[PDB]
Amino acid sequence: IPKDTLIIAVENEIARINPAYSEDHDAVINLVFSGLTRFDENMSLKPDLAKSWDISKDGLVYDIFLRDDVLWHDGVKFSADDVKFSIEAFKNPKNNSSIYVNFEDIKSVEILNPSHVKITLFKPYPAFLDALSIGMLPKHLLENENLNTSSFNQNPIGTGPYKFVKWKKGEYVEFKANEHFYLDKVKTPRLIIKHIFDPSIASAELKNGKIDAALIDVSLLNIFKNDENFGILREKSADYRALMFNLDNEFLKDLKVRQALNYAVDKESIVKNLLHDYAFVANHPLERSWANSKNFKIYKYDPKKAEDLLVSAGFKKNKDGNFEKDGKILEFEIWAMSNDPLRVSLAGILQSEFRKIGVVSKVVAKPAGSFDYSKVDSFLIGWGSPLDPDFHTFRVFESSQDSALNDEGWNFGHYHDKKVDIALQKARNTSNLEERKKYYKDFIDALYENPPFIFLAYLDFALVYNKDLKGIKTRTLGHHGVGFTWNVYEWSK
Ligand SMILES: N[C@@H](Cc1c[nH]c[nH+]1)C(=O)O
Ligand SMILES: [Mg+2]
Ligand code: NI
């Protein structure tokens, strides 16, 4: 690989390179686009396209002041027009934006002058500044387009550090440095995002020198020991793994069953042995957040509590020593993405724990994208954001976000809890920080009393990189390790 070219592998690919359809599962949107705000090495809110902002006392009015030295990749200037268009596009239900929920509380967007936009809200939404980091859209290209289907989505123009060059689908996306980047000089002139979902192949291509960097599963990490072409950077993350219950399932809809299944698992055993202390035991989805109550009940590893719960639910043990109810065995499937060894291994351990308490389960391992995980009995799932606590909680747990009911929802297990709904809505619409913490405490407590998941472990990630690489900075990563390329414009060899 030439010195003026950077090649990075990422596991997840997106169909539309457009902030409006961002699902925190990609690395290319933050390359092409830039938002009004951004985050530094410490996850602190920093100015990006917006040079500064003022927020009204009641949190309903945002005055945003824009930089005037920003160009779109087509040489067209960034202005307040783009901001009004972008935000109005996110809000428009006809665009089916994946980030619609972050913009739904917006009343109006006013252009006061070409560098000053005034945003008014129906209700407070303190995550708004975090939400505005997502990336602005070019008005002059998309004004007369169908955002859902526009060819723009496969030929994007943004204000980010990198320009779109060409896209080989299922292969790679190539970028070139934005010569007019306002924030900083983009160091490496060529950037290739290579799509590799198989970690063994990712490891092999590193050894081959076909790619410069990738996130490598901990089980494969020992392979790069003694290798001198590579350094290893350990990164913390808000990413957790869990078992998603499908509450449509005849057995998993029952509360007593889900509580019993939580009692059956020795998460410390899992973390210690399977993850080699590259993790810690998870109990709820906000344990890296300020919203963490650090004062919550847990389901502690206790098989007889588990078995006793199942009897209470009305299950009788049979001659095989497996629970049955009204003539039918307590049986369901555990699906895992076969391309993710950690998930397959976790599903395998879960199956073994469940049998020891007389629950029959079947592990189904299929490649990511080959099946609909919102229709399987249970699924080894993952989520987690280092940003506002609302971002991977509302779409994931709130009942209106049921994916069967909402095409842009992330509630794949069809979970419906009234207390979760109220707590998340009030938390996302409350300005006071301490009051927010109280509502997220309610949320966590509500999750305990009616578990949608079996929370398992928060993950650390390992970045394996060409040792010739300069300028890499670590920070708290999100789900799938998204964000490890956050400062890639500083990268050079
Ligand atoms: N984010 C969820 C769903 C998903 C499927 N593929 C990628 N993500 C998970 O990681 O389990
Ligand atoms: Mg950005
Ligand atoms: Ni995911």
XYZ file of C-alpha atoms and ligand atoms in Angstrom:
506
model
C 0.000 0.000 0.000
C 1.348 3.438 -1.059
C 2.110 6.086 1.576
C -0.546 8.441 0.204
C -3.248 5.793 0.560
C -5.023 4.539 3.665
C -6.970 1.270 3.681
C -9.223 0.447 6.629
C -11.570 -2.492 7.079
C -15.005 -2.114 8.670
C -17.527 -4.896 9.311
C -20.728 -2.973 8.557
C -21.760 -1.430 5.245
C -24.622 0.956 4.470
C -26.814 1.191 1.366
C -27.227 4.977 1.464
C -24.318 7.306 2.309
C -26.552 9.953 3.819
C -26.839 11.237 7.424
C -30.636 11.031 7.132
C -30.344 7.238 7.077
C -27.564 6.910 9.648
C -28.026 3.998 12.022
C -24.724 4.261 13.893
C -23.542 1.195 11.962
C -21.097 2.768 9.514
C -17.844 4.668 9.112
C -18.429 6.445 5.786
C -21.028 9.070 6.782
C -18.706 10.873 9.209
C -16.042 10.889 6.432
C -18.162 12.536 3.752
C -20.320 14.724 5.972
C -19.893 17.034 8.957
C -22.536 18.234 11.397
C -22.999 21.506 13.254
C -21.189 19.914 16.191
C -18.631 17.179 16.807
C -16.869 15.372 19.645
C -13.217 15.356 20.701
C -10.959 12.688 22.203
C -12.826 13.044 25.515
C -16.308 12.886 23.955
C -16.786 16.568 24.755
C -19.115 18.640 22.594
C -17.123 20.790 20.154
C -18.036 23.238 17.368
C -17.912 21.989 13.771
C -20.009 23.635 11.053
C -21.417 25.821 13.835
C -18.841 28.210 15.265
C -21.013 28.816 18.347
C -24.509 28.583 19.819
C -26.802 30.094 22.431
C -29.656 28.235 24.117
C -32.701 29.944 25.618
C -33.393 29.685 29.339
C -36.270 27.249 28.836
C -34.315 25.171 26.324
C -36.857 25.796 23.559
C -34.854 28.205 21.384
C -31.509 27.458 19.754
C -29.521 30.221 18.089
C -26.840 28.671 15.908
C -24.003 30.665 14.327
C -22.303 29.123 11.304
C -18.799 29.245 9.894
C -18.679 31.164 6.612
C -15.559 29.490 5.195
C -17.027 26.041 4.484
C -17.370 24.504 1.021
C -19.362 21.511 -0.164
C -17.345 18.995 -2.209
C -18.766 20.355 -5.473
C -17.252 23.751 -4.640
C -20.592 25.206 -3.576
C -20.558 27.185 -0.337
C -22.133 25.905 2.867
C -24.764 28.333 4.169
C -27.773 28.602 6.468
C -29.949 27.383 3.571
C -28.399 23.926 3.936
C -29.168 23.791 7.671
C -32.836 24.690 7.277
C -33.195 22.158 4.468
C -31.310 19.436 6.342
C -33.296 19.696 9.570
C -36.620 19.991 7.736
C -35.673 16.865 5.755
C -34.970 14.863 8.950
C -38.366 15.974 10.354
C -40.358 15.090 7.248
C -41.986 11.661 7.784
C -42.135 11.226 4.011
C -38.330 10.902 4.128
C -38.482 7.993 6.623
C -35.358 9.264 8.340
C -33.618 6.794 10.618
C -32.905 9.760 12.917
C -36.434 11.219 12.824
C -36.882 10.758 16.584
C -33.986 13.149 17.268
C -35.758 15.922 15.405
C -39.464 15.318 16.048
C -39.807 17.949 18.791
C -38.767 20.770 16.424
C -41.294 23.545 15.802
C -39.516 25.687 13.200
C -36.189 26.524 11.559
C -35.637 30.213 10.790
C -32.909 31.761 8.624
C -32.020 35.147 10.112
C -28.956 35.701 7.924
C -26.746 33.354 5.856
C -24.679 32.528 8.973
C -27.422 32.528 11.621
C -30.187 29.968 12.093
C -32.825 29.984 14.849
C -34.318 26.660 15.907
C -37.458 26.554 18.046
C -38.725 23.441 19.843
C -42.172 22.355 21.040
C -40.556 20.785 24.094
C -37.028 20.693 25.536
C -34.624 18.184 23.953
C -31.175 18.462 25.647
C -29.692 15.856 23.277
C -30.274 18.275 20.396
C -26.646 19.459 20.175
C -25.452 15.836 20.201
C -28.017 15.080 17.489
C -26.736 17.938 15.339
C -23.346 16.226 14.971
C -24.842 13.829 12.454
C -24.087 15.723 9.222
C -25.646 18.453 7.098
C -27.135 17.939 3.618
C -26.560 20.032 0.434
C -29.757 21.938 -0.484
C -28.750 22.654 -4.090
C -28.584 18.916 -4.849
C -31.440 17.427 -2.833
C -34.132 20.125 -2.858
C -36.037 18.599 -5.770
C -35.169 14.986 -5.022
C -36.752 12.026 -3.316
C -34.373 11.692 -0.380
C -35.381 8.048 0.113
C -34.231 6.939 -3.306
C -32.041 9.694 -4.775
C -28.901 8.675 -6.679
C -27.206 11.159 -4.319
C -27.268 8.336 -1.758
C -24.733 6.424 -3.866
C -22.880 9.555 -5.032
C -22.801 11.810 -1.925
C -21.566 15.401 -1.615
C -20.725 16.669 1.882
C -18.543 18.998 3.956
C -16.505 16.317 5.686
C -12.729 15.651 5.524
C -13.104 13.148 2.670
C -14.656 13.287 -0.794
C -16.525 10.392 -2.417
C -14.603 8.871 -5.346
C -16.152 5.514 -6.263
C -18.034 2.600 -4.724
C -17.614 -1.121 -5.418
C -20.576 -2.560 -3.556
C -19.715 -5.412 -1.198
C -16.058 -4.563 -1.824
C -14.958 -1.054 -0.859
C -15.661 2.654 -0.901
C -12.827 4.920 -2.051
C -12.328 8.511 -0.877
C -9.980 11.410 -1.590
C -8.927 14.182 0.804
C -11.111 17.299 0.874
C -8.578 19.925 -0.223
C -10.744 22.713 1.188
C -11.419 21.179 4.633
C -12.000 24.032 7.103
C -11.286 22.185 10.344
C -7.809 20.890 9.544
C -5.604 19.813 6.663
C -6.586 16.281 5.643
C -3.294 14.403 5.845
C -3.731 11.174 3.838
C -4.823 11.907 0.231
C -6.405 8.505 -0.441
C -8.750 6.616 1.850
C -10.324 3.245 1.183
C -13.023 1.765 3.403
C -12.896 -1.993 2.770
C -15.939 -4.045 3.762
C -14.896 -7.148 5.709
C -17.370 -8.780 8.114
C -15.279 -11.928 8.639
C -12.594 -11.255 11.303
C -10.329 -14.116 10.205
C -10.216 -12.626 6.718
C -9.592 -9.199 8.275
C -6.654 -10.676 10.190
C -5.314 -12.387 7.064
C -5.462 -9.230 4.959
C -3.612 -7.330 7.685
C -0.812 -9.916 7.611
C -0.864 -9.634 3.806
C -0.522 -5.860 3.947
C -3.688 -5.405 1.909
C -5.241 -3.235 4.630
C -3.643 -0.771 7.072
C -5.998 -1.152 10.025
C -9.000 -2.997 11.418
C -10.804 -3.819 14.637
C -9.901 -7.423 15.425
C -11.925 -9.741 17.676
C -10.173 -10.495 20.983
C -10.074 -14.239 20.209
C -7.906 -13.451 17.165
C -5.728 -10.854 18.889
C -2.935 -13.267 19.883
C -2.104 -13.675 16.184
C -0.559 -10.191 16.074
C 1.726 -10.897 19.017
C 5.382 -10.383 18.038
C 4.287 -9.095 14.620
C 6.299 -5.886 14.138
C 4.297 -4.488 11.256
C 1.490 -3.742 13.716
C 0.701 -1.990 16.983
C -2.382 -2.788 19.080
C -4.578 -0.102 20.675
C -7.100 -1.159 23.304
C -10.267 0.965 23.247
C -13.133 1.290 25.743
C -16.718 1.273 24.437
C -20.381 1.677 25.357
C -21.099 -1.436 23.266
C -22.810 -4.260 25.131
C -23.889 -7.760 24.117
C -27.158 -9.283 25.266
C -29.832 -11.846 24.479
C -32.840 -10.199 22.847
C -36.099 -11.832 23.851
C -38.781 -11.866 21.176
C -41.919 -11.143 23.173
C -44.046 -12.606 20.400
C -42.751 -16.051 21.424
C -45.289 -18.234 23.263
C -42.832 -18.800 26.117
C -40.682 -15.645 26.119
C -43.658 -13.282 26.480
C -44.031 -14.571 30.069
C -42.235 -12.401 32.634
C -41.399 -15.299 34.951
C -39.620 -17.106 32.095
C -37.491 -14.108 31.177
C -36.556 -13.584 34.845
C -35.727 -17.279 35.173
C -33.503 -17.178 32.080
C -31.649 -14.178 33.517
C -30.931 -16.089 36.758
C -29.433 -19.011 34.806
C -26.382 -17.161 33.455
C -22.953 -16.786 35.087
C -21.808 -13.579 33.401
C -18.532 -13.367 35.341
C -17.635 -16.824 34.035
C -18.442 -15.597 30.542
C -16.392 -12.394 30.816
C -13.372 -14.004 32.480
C -13.058 -17.115 30.337
C -14.527 -16.130 26.964
C -13.473 -12.472 26.780
C -10.166 -12.577 28.701
C -11.010 -9.498 30.792
C -11.496 -7.431 27.624
C -14.921 -6.701 29.018
C -17.035 -6.344 32.124
C -20.392 -7.812 33.154
C -23.395 -5.889 31.821
C -26.683 -5.426 33.671
C -28.357 -2.527 31.837
C -27.729 -0.433 28.699
C -26.303 2.788 30.236
C -23.355 1.645 32.357
C -20.865 3.964 30.611
C -23.247 6.930 30.759
C -23.638 9.750 33.253
C -27.226 8.517 33.285
C -26.022 5.383 35.115
C -27.752 5.233 38.506
C -25.006 3.057 40.048
C -27.783 1.925 42.375
C -29.863 -0.745 40.661
C -30.991 -4.303 41.328
C -29.446 -7.109 39.328
C -30.302 -10.665 38.382
C -27.600 -12.655 40.091
C -26.386 -16.063 38.899
C -28.632 -18.535 40.724
C -29.910 -21.677 38.902
C -32.332 -22.856 41.616
C -33.993 -19.420 41.838
C -34.324 -19.844 38.087
C -35.803 -23.351 38.274
C -38.129 -22.325 41.089
C -39.438 -19.393 39.011
C -40.302 -21.746 36.153
C -42.319 -23.977 38.483
C -44.173 -20.899 39.715
C -44.913 -19.928 36.105
C -46.657 -23.277 35.719
C -44.021 -25.481 34.143
C -43.717 -29.128 35.176
C -40.501 -31.061 34.746
C -40.891 -34.183 32.621
C -39.114 -37.542 32.536
C -36.265 -36.062 30.501
C -35.834 -33.411 33.191
C -36.971 -30.589 30.937
C -39.748 -28.150 31.753
C -43.116 -28.576 30.056
C -46.315 -26.568 30.262
C -49.767 -27.703 29.189
C -48.252 -30.536 27.160
C -45.590 -28.477 25.374
C -41.874 -28.282 26.188
C -40.239 -24.931 26.983
C -38.299 -24.699 23.744
C -37.010 -21.832 21.579
C -34.120 -20.910 19.262
C -31.049 -18.735 19.857
C -29.838 -16.950 16.722
C -26.344 -15.563 16.315
C -24.447 -13.951 13.470
C -22.067 -16.702 12.382
C -19.572 -14.099 11.193
C -19.107 -12.924 14.803
C -17.300 -15.624 16.821
C -18.017 -13.818 20.096
C -21.756 -13.972 19.438
C -21.684 -17.631 18.396
C -19.664 -18.468 21.499
C -21.996 -16.435 23.714
C -25.043 -18.184 22.230
C -23.386 -21.551 22.834
C -22.721 -20.747 26.478
C -26.276 -19.479 26.890
C -27.657 -22.764 25.510
C -25.576 -24.728 28.021
C -26.702 -22.590 30.955
C -30.336 -22.985 29.908
C -30.165 -26.777 29.699
C -28.669 -27.039 33.191
C -31.950 -25.545 34.410
C -33.992 -27.713 32.053
C -34.624 -25.278 29.220
C -34.270 -26.727 25.734
C -32.795 -24.341 23.173
C -31.355 -24.562 19.665
C -28.463 -22.371 18.532
C -28.862 -21.110 14.959
C -25.767 -19.502 13.470
C -26.289 -17.718 10.144
C -24.394 -14.838 8.460
C -25.441 -11.257 9.256
C -27.999 -10.083 6.699
C -29.182 -13.606 5.829
C -32.177 -13.550 8.193
C -34.681 -11.278 9.951
C -33.653 -11.117 13.610
C -36.946 -9.394 14.520
C -38.769 -12.675 13.731
C -36.593 -15.235 15.539
C -37.314 -16.505 19.063
C -34.240 -14.865 20.574
C -31.184 -13.101 19.195
C -27.708 -12.350 20.399
C -27.960 -8.600 20.025
C -25.768 -5.561 20.629
C -26.196 -1.802 21.133
C -24.524 1.139 22.831
C -23.674 4.801 22.407
C -21.039 7.004 24.096
C -23.259 10.009 23.363
C -26.556 11.037 24.982
C -28.313 8.196 26.871
C -31.387 8.734 24.679
C -29.664 7.680 21.441
C -29.588 3.897 21.846
C -32.462 3.665 24.311
C -35.495 5.349 22.704
C -35.447 3.571 19.317
C -34.400 0.329 21.039
C -36.827 0.057 23.995
C -39.725 2.503 23.547
C -42.925 0.802 22.395
C -43.682 3.095 19.437
C -40.315 1.938 18.041
C -41.445 -1.685 17.593
C -39.873 -2.629 14.234
C -42.994 -4.546 13.251
C -44.940 -1.291 13.745
C -42.246 1.237 12.723
C -39.869 0.594 9.779
C -37.295 2.897 11.371
C -37.680 1.461 14.880
C -34.942 -0.557 16.597
C -37.245 -2.433 18.989
C -36.643 -5.769 17.263
C -37.982 -7.870 20.150
C -41.337 -6.052 20.073
C -40.974 -4.985 23.716
C -43.835 -2.950 25.238
C -43.502 -1.528 28.753
C -45.519 1.484 29.899
C -42.987 2.511 32.557
C -40.106 2.373 30.085
C -42.107 4.494 27.618
C -42.884 7.198 30.193
C -39.376 7.245 31.662
C -37.616 7.553 28.290
C -39.968 10.246 26.978
C -39.747 12.375 30.116
C -35.981 11.870 30.267
C -35.477 13.027 26.681
C -37.720 16.068 27.215
C -36.272 17.284 30.520
C -33.622 20.012 30.589
C -32.465 19.540 34.180
C -29.593 17.034 34.353
C -30.410 15.668 37.796
C -34.033 15.233 36.737
C -32.828 13.399 33.627
C -30.800 11.060 35.846
C -33.924 10.329 37.886
C -35.965 9.403 34.816
C -33.162 7.178 33.497
C -33.034 5.611 36.953
C -36.736 4.850 36.532
C -35.934 3.409 33.097
C -33.232 1.110 34.445
C -35.472 0.008 37.317
C -38.318 -0.583 34.845
C -35.994 -2.745 32.759
C -35.181 -4.841 35.828
C -38.828 -5.526 36.685
C -39.676 -6.415 33.068
C -36.489 -7.628 31.304
C -36.448 -7.334 27.485
C -32.920 -8.778 27.408
C -30.397 -10.867 29.223
C -27.645 -8.273 29.482
C -24.242 -9.983 29.290
C -21.112 -7.877 28.781
C -19.776 -4.470 27.792
C -16.996 -4.859 25.252
C -13.571 -3.335 24.815
C -12.185 -3.214 21.276
C -8.744 -3.754 19.808
C -7.501 -1.623 16.940
C -4.727 -3.332 14.997
C -2.852 -0.840 12.817
C 0.127 -0.402 10.485
C 2.910 0.833 12.774
C 3.876 3.411 10.133
C 0.561 5.149 10.958
C 0.751 8.572 12.604
C -1.924 10.633 14.343
C -4.284 7.972 15.708
C -6.280 8.899 18.829
C -8.450 6.599 20.954
C -11.747 7.478 22.629
C -14.902 5.835 23.953
C -16.260 3.823 21.031
C -19.876 3.093 20.154
C -21.700 -0.038 18.985
C -19.554 -2.297 16.711
C -16.628 -0.026 17.531
C -18.074 2.737 15.357
C -16.072 5.895 15.967
C -12.588 4.413 15.863
C -12.026 6.352 12.633
C -13.272 9.631 14.155
C -9.998 11.502 13.558
C -8.824 9.627 10.448
C -8.078 12.936 8.685
C -5.210 13.272 11.155
C -3.878 9.841 10.147
C -0.718 9.586 8.059
C 2.146 7.190 7.337
N -27.290 -3.479 16.221
C -27.886 -4.801 16.398
C -28.565 -5.259 15.107
C -27.616 -5.509 13.980
C -27.642 -6.396 12.957
N -26.516 -6.195 12.200
C -25.815 -5.208 12.738
N -26.448 -4.780 13.809
C -26.827 -5.817 16.797
O -25.641 -5.537 16.666
O -27.122 -6.946 17.204
Mg -18.881 14.527 12.142
Ni -25.554 -3.718 15.398
